[PDB]
Point group: D2
Chain length 274, copies 4
Amino acid sequence: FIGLGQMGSPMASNLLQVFDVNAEAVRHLVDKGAANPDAEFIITMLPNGDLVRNVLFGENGVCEGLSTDLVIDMSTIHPLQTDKLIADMQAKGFSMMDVPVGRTSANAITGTLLLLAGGTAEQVERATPILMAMGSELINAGGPGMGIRVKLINNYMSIALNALSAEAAVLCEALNLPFDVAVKVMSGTAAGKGHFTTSWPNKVLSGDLSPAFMIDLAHKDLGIALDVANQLHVPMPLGAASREVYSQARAAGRGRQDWSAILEQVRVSAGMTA
Amino acid sequence: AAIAFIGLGQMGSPMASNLLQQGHQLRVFDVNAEAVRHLVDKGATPAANPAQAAKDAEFIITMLPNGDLVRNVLFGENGVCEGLSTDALVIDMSTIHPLQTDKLIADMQAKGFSMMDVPVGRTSANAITGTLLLLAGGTAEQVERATPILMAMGSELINAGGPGMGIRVKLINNYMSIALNALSAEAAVLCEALNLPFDVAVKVMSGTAAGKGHFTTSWPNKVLSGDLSPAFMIDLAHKDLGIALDVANQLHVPMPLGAASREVYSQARAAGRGRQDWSAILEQVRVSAGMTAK
Amino acid sequence: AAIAFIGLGQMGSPMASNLLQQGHQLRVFDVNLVDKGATPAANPAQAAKDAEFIITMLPNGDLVRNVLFGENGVCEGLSTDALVIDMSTIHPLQTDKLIADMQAKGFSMMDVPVGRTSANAITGTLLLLAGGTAEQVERATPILMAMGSELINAGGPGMGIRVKLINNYMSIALNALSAEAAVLCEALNLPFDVAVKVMSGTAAGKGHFTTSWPNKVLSGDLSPAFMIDLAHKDLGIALDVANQLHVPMPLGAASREVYSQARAAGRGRQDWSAILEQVRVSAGMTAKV
Amino acid sequence: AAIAFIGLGQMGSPMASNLLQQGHQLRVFDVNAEAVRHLVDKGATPAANPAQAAKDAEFIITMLPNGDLVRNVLFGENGVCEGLSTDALVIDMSTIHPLQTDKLIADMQAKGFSMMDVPVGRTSANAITGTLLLLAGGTAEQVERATPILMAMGSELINAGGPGMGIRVKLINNYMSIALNALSAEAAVLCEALNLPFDVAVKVMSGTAAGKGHFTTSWPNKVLSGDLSPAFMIDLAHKDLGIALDVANQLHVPMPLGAASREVYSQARAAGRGRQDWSAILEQVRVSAGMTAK
Ligand SMILES: NC(=O)c1ccc[n+]([C@@H]2O[C@H](COP(=O)([O-])OP(=O)(O)OC[C@H]3O[C@@H](n4cnc5c(N)ncnc54)[C@H](O)[C@@H]3O)[C@@H](O)[C@H]2O)c1
Ligand SMILES: O=S(=O)(O)C[C@@H](O)CO
Ligand SMILES: O=S(=O)(O)C[C@@H](O)CO
């Protein structure tokens, strides 16, 4: 176990049923059961992909003391950094898999993390028994580097959504609507349940852009929301940006398409095809 | 009961159709005569204008595209006001500006008339099957009076808890879902650009705040309880957002909402919230809007 | 000349005052100048009776319509020989509709909104942004030069409001961008005066309109002087630094996603002036180059 | 003088060409052998790698796309450090991350070598004519030593006032100019969508802060003098921005920078700045960045 941070410390604690630069962190794990990296499994849980590399390949690195018999990076790092590390370890005969975790440090404590299993379909079994104690659910990401990839998508979505949710909630407060009422409504719609499993499956994801809710009408409602926010001085940077995305969809002739067609617009914007 | 229905559009037409199916007597108006004709086939009496539609109706329903057309249908040349009785109840089910709704409810309360806001959640497919989400504003008395009529058009009613609270919860819901659609698109195209099957992303996000939202997950026992002690620190959220935007920018997936959201997290860091729970972003947006800190 | 003036606000009041000072005869109305020689009127209609020129200076295009076409409106008192001058800053499409709805009833209407502040309204040194026909601008110029010091022929009906909006959009948004650059400057402990000296030698301080654009994108030449890929990369460095120093840069952040869209569309090796072409395509216009 | 020049791109090539024209001896390296060949025709000595280029050079110039390629050219396999003397002066004229520059200047100061940052303002058109703006970081001694070499590539030099201050003022300049290009595009396309000739817009904007900028017009005697009394009120600026965004949204001209800018003005209004001069936006962005109000 390399890394005794907000996630590392409780994860290692659940295993006890070790190296870190902070001697106090070392001391806390010793009083629950190494100066640098004959173990079957190396787990790294470190803040960035540089520290992971410097802990595997640096002066007094893991590689110098590692056996030819899975290294599991559970860190949140750059996917391309993960790909290069898995290849640079595959180059020297060693096996490396990416198993980052979903959910927070509260779930790390209770061993109820979402385990986001990258690496080979075979390789998942080899580490799976060990890591299925540290989380409550495992998702087969379906290849090397797919673990960190689905972690990034999930974290992007949840972190940005928090900012958007804040704008909606303070506009709610500025309009003197109890938040409890907003939440009750939004829990029954895409607002609370998301579009991924509601508006998208039978429309854009099925290649059907025939309208259930038209982009023009969505665009118009966004205008009302931004007028209200601007008269009540609730800054809504995400709302403001989102209206200009809808505006781009209108410019491209998608005005009478279903709102799920925004997905197709962002695909075109990224230089993808239909 | 005797109902006037003005606005026979994608929503209006099947809503009015469900009222007739439930044995109500409808006077219908809309500028499109074909829309009028579809409801007349189904038993509605046609009216030449809003005034005629409103004559001796207990309930006046408007379903129109904006608050100006609602005003011009209530107060304009041959308006609802000209044919309305002081005993009737006006239900605007339109999505319009909440402050336009407040002014219309007051300008109808000024002339002895009763007006309530009952906008709807869900689409035209649900209007057809009478399974709309009914977002009932107006007084508890007005909601009780109107509920029997409303339950012919929708399968669920939510008491929004006052005049104008119906349109407000509609606006908050629609703001959230319309903007979220744009954010969801950024996540899905970054997913595709990284060659991750989308079904895998959705499976993962369905188990976290990404798919379940923050309102009922990260918020209740943290910021909404006045506890800002970190479960997930703003600085770490800020860092992960940076990685996402670096990747998107290397793969040329434009993420305007992500990019804006990082500058919100940056503002939270500048204000000393870096070691607070990510739910503290709510407190940052409240301060940013000139509200008193909780 | 015989003038009706409707709207005696922060701008209206001193503008009408300068018209009287220049020996014009004013009928004035406002919902809330007589000391200074104006005849008061009970409503727009009365104000308009036997006026050659009707001036409106109101906060929005709805109040302009309700003052021209409403109960006791200007149309009620206007002659077919008179000229309506809306000097209000309102929606351009609202101006177009008002000029047409007045041309429909035999009345003549031009847009002459004003640039510069209420200090300039007081001294009669406003920037006059003269829309309307060449004839209407000639006819109105003598009246207008009593309220402003400089007149710009916008070159048609509705072009007055349009050039006001474009100018004000550009300057108001630029203020926000300039702020981001200046605070990042301070966060890096670079004296501002040094940054300004440097930026005065580049498009940063001189702008792109008259520097990098004329001989590149505006000439249909997209061959690089400065490549979009490198511009995109520099924006990345700026946002990383700002994010480490907690200087929020919402305009920078948005701008990088615009450059990112230009890269997605295959413009990475084009000149940075090609961003104009990208925004034209984004707005559903036909590509020029 | 004996100069090593590594990076013969859109900037590098003509800069090195101007050094040869001024009778300096250049050892040139680039991964593109055709770029090497163009400067060899003009009198340059080709080198197989950075090391060879650096052997017995008084001045080492790097002009590369990013700070990683600069490091790999200075410290990599057959790097500049392998052929560099303790007597030479390394001048990175690249646009890279300021912290990457600080680390490179320190990692070269650690091995007895001298390194300074002299990035350039203006484009490759100015590189060709030797009229670059030279943004001289490093010590005043290093700037004096390098100035005669530098003045062959640029027409003016600005003493940025220390190591790493060259790249810092380059970043401020480049941030401003790159983002301004995006904003200028929004204004010009809204202009076209409204069927207003651009030349008319430019004539007007040339007489205001739109064309002249705020730094030297609206800011000096207001916010930069500590005076926030209005010439143009934030509320009025906020209103005009709203009209522009309504028009753009009706004509489907996407204006992401405009839309973001209005939310900045909105934050200024929430903070009580509505009746302050528009120059007070500077003070709002300072507060947003956690700086003390001036
Ligand atoms: N283009 C401008 O207007 C301008 C002006 C001022 C500053 N800058 C900055 O100056 C730098 C150079 O810009 P440019 O316009 O010359 O770009 P460019 O891509 O035309 O020049 C880069 C050159 O470096 C070469 N190169 C890349 N990696 C190399 C390596 N490891 N070893 C040797 N050669 C290598 C490339 O082949 C190319 O010839 C960048 O940092 C840029 O942002 C650009
Ligand atoms: O993935 S989420 O649960 O939204 C965030 C948590 O994983 C913190 O890293
Ligand atoms: O200095 S600017 O004219 O803003 C751009 C050019 O120098 C490229 O770096």
